[PDB]
Amino acid sequence: STTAV
Which method, experimentally, gave rise to this model?
NMR
Residue 2 CA to residue 4 CA, distance in Å, equals 7
Going by the DSSP 8-state scheme, the letter that residue 1 receives in this structure is -
DSSP structure string for 1-5: -----
Residue 5 CA to residue 2 CA, distance in Å, equals 10
Count of alpha carbons within 13 Å of 5, Cβ hemisphere only? 0
Round the CA-based radius of gyration of the chain to a whole number and report it.
5
